[PDB]
Amino acid sequence: DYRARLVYPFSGAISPHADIVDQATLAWAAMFGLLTDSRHKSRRLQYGLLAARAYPRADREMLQIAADWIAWLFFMDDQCDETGIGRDLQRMIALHERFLAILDGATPEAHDCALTYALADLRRRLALRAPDNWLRRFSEHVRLYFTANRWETVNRQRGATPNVATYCAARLFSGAVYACFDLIELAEQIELPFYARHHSIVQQLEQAANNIICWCNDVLSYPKEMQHGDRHNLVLVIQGEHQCSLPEAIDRALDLHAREVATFVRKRTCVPYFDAAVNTALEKYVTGLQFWICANRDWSLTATRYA
Amino acid sequence: DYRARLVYPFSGAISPHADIVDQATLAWAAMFGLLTKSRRLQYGLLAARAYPRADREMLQIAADWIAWLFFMDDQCDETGIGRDLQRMIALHERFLAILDGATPEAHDCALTYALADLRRRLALRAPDNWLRRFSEHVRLYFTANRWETVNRQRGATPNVATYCAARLFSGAVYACFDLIELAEQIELPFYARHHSIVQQLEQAANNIICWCNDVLSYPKEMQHGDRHNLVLVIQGEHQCSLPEAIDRALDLHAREVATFVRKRTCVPYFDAAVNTALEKYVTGLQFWICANRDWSLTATRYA
Ligand SMILES: CC(C)=CCC/C(C)=C/CC[C@H](C)CCOP(=O)(O)OP(=O)(O)O
Ligand SMILES: CC(C)=CCC/C(C)=C/CC[C@H](C)CCOP(=O)(O)OP(=O)(O)O
Ligand SMILES: [Mg+2]
Ligand SMILES: [Mg+2]
Ligand SMILES: [Mg+2]
Ligand SMILES: [Mg+2]
Numbered sequence: 001d002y003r004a005r006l007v008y009p010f011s012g013a014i015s016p017h018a019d020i021v022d023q024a025t026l027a028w029a030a031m032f033g034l035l036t037d038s039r040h041k042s043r044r045l046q047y048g049l050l051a052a053r054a055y056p057r058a059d060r061e062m063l064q065i066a067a068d069w070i071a072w073l074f075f076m077d078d079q080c081d082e083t084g085i086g087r088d089l090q091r092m093i094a095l096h097e098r099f100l101a102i103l104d105g106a107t108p109e110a111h112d113c114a115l116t117y118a119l120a121d122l123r124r125r126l127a128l129r130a131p132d133n134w135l136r137r138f139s140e141h142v143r144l145y146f147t148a149n150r151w152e153t154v155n156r157q158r159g160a161t162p163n164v165a166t167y168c169a170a171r172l173f174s175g176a177v178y179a180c181f182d183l184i185e186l187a188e189q190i191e192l193p194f195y196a197r198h199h200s201i202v203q204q205l206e207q208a209a210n211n212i213i214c215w216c217n218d219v220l221s222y223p224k225e226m227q228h229g230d231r232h233n234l235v236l237v238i239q240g241e242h243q244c245s246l247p248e249a250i251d252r253a254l255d256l257h258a259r260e261v262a263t264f265v266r267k268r269t270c271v272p273y274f275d276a277a278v279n280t281a282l283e284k285y286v287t288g289l290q291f292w293i294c295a296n297r298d299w300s301l302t303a304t305r306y307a
Numbered sequence: 308d309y310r311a312r313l314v315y316p317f318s319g320a321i322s323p324h325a326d327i328v329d330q331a332t333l334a335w336a337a338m339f340g341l342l343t344k345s346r347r348l349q350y351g352l353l354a355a356r357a358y359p360r361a362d363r364e365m366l367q368i369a370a371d372w373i374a375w376l377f378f379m380d381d382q383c384d385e386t387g388i389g390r391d392l393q394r395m396i397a398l399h400e401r402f403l404a405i406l407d408g409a410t411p412e413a414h415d416c417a418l419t420y421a422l423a424d425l426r427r428r429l430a431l432r433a434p435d436n437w438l439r440r441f442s443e444h445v446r447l448y449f450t451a452n453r454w455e456t457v458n459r460q461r462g463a464t465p466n467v468a469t470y471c472a473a474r475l476f477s478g479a480v481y482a483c484f485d486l487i488e489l490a491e492q493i494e495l496p497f498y499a500r501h502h503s504i505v506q507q508l509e510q511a512a513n514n515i516i517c518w519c520n521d522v523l524s525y526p527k528e529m530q531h532g533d534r535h536n537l538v539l540v541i542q543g544e545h546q547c548s549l550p551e552a553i554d555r556a557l558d559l560h561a562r563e564v565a566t567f568v569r570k571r572t573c574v575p576y577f578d579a580a581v582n583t584a585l586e587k588y589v590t591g592l593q594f595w596i597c598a599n600r601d602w603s604l605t606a607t608r609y610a
């Protein structure tokens with residue numbers, strides 16, 4: 001049982017609003033027409049129960065935006081990774097031109113699809129809770145996620161599996177984890193000054209947490225990705241580069257995950273002293289990264305998505 | 308004296324267009340009424356060293372941009388607006404409008420018009436993703452300058468950790484690093500452009516350029532009573548002599564040079580085309596490190 005090795009020297013938490021938020025996410029999906037034919041299965045999506053773990057101290061209104069955003073990501077992701085649009089760059093470019101217009105604050109038009117309308121709704125709701133500087137940073141992380149998904153599409157279309165270095169570098173954006181990390185600021189109601197927000201050690205803590213979450217997901221989701229012939233997965237990329245067995249590739253992936261956990265724990269104590277207020281806010285942010293690491297693992301072990 | 312210790316284990320270069328670009332930067336600065344000894348500014352001779360392989364058209368934008376920063380910088384560091392937050396917020400609101408695409412209005416100042424001209428010219432050479440990354444770095448430069456202004460007004464000195472973190476943005480070096488992509492005509496994929504090792508190389512090069520400037524510019528900054536300088540921040544934190552503060556700043560500079568050349572050997576292998584483009588970008592960081600030092604030692608600005 002290789003899944004037993006996905007362990008951390010810290011624990012997570014869940015918002016008491018978890019089930020209320022999950023039911024509201026299903027109602028939001030229905031409202032914006034994101035629930036496709038494939039009804040009874042929708043009851044066990046449980047996207048709100050991941051959000052509830054990722055932002056456990058958030059007010060219900062803010063948690064609901066995070067939950068709806070996570071739902072959006074899964075709906076978009078399953079299109080990219082399991083349907084035709086993921087093998088069609090020109091279709092994806094056309095869609096992303098609409099998303100990018102909506103991220104700049106353009107109102108959707110009659111011809112726009114459900115996902116564009118739903119994105120516009122999330123941007124509108126975030127604009128009410130967040131200042132302009134935050135909105136710009138979130139939008140750029142979402143833009144980089146679109147860029148990364150266009151890159152994954154070209155790989156699928158050309159039948160090309162990236163090397164480990166390229167995959168790991170791209171994975172940091174293809175999973176939209178940085179955009180989710182931006183929501184921690186709103187969940188914790190913290191205003192980090194520019195010099196603290198972008199500090200090298202904070203960036204390295206963000207990178208480590210992102211790698212941990214993505215590589216944990218890669219170990220839990222290689223089976224379903226193999227079924228669809230999509231090798232955007234640390235296990236499958238390691239297998240191709242090292243020409244090794246699947247058990248060996250899984251073992252190597254878990255070793256990289258364990259090393260990245262140790263790196264995160266180590267760098268947590270390398271945060272320099274700015275002032276009392278800034279460091280208090282900074283420790284709430286870094287605590288947020290730990291909640292996310294645990295949320296991903298705790299939710300993913302209990303989800304039929306990876307069964 | 309202590310200036311002799313500002314050394315690098317690599318060399319720079321200068322564009323053959325250096326003098327016509329510098330002369331054209333003066334002409335541009337006069338045209339926009341940014342001039343009010345002009346021939347001794349030599350802002351084009353910094354640009355020519357920073358982007359030595361750039362085509363003349365692209366180098367001219369870079370030179371005009373560097374001139375813009377110096378004009379803006381002297382107003383912040385030697386003039387009243389640098390000790391007036393609400394006035395700076397008003398000016399920055401006009402700049403941020405221009406950066407988003409808004410055309411200047413009747414009673415916008417010379418700088419706002421000059422910034423709009425630079426944005427227009429950059430839009431002809433660079434795609435939207437580039438313009439956004441550049442705009443964000445310039446926005447963080449404005450934010451860093453507003454932070455410096457609050458410090459000046461309250462007569463506050465930040466600790467070394469706070470100053471170094473803020474200095475990375477107050478110098479606009481990242482905005483200048485963005486221009487390397489255009490100078491060198493390279494298109495780095497997202498995953499290489501934002502790679503942790505590339506970020507750490509940019510941070511090291513930024514630290515080196517800023518701390519080199521701090522050692523060469525502490526005299527003129529003391530005269531204006533400005534403490535945004537590694538030497539002066541070290542002196543305040545450690546309560547040491549000025550010679551000891553300079554020695555400590557130069558040790559941090561030397562240590563950062565060692566870090567930069569070490570992390571150059573830690574760049575992963577992505578593919579042939581990407582690593583070819585990356586090595587041109589990282590070489591660009593080296594050109595900038597050398598350009599800053601080479602230009603500053605011959606500039607009357609720090610005499
Ligand atoms: C769906 C999405 C992009 C984000 C949802 C929120 C989130 C940050 C989840 C953590 C897991 C991981 C980063 C998803 C990566 O996509 P991948 O396609 O490998 O996910 P899958 O294995 O579940 O399909
Ligand atoms: C003027 C400016 C923002 C940039 C021009 C181009 C550039 C990146 C020059 C390198 C020197 C340094 C980063 C300037 C920092 O401002 P500081 O105020 O310490 O400069 P000074 O010492 O020359 O006054
Ligand atoms: Mg997927
Ligand atoms: Mg995916
Ligand atoms: Mg997966
Ligand atoms: Mg200055």
Ligand SMILES: [Mg+2]
Nearest residue numbers: 380383384477
């Ligand atoms: Mg300055």
Ligand SMILES: [Mg+2]
Nearest residue numbers: 520521524525
């Ligand atoms: Mg200076």
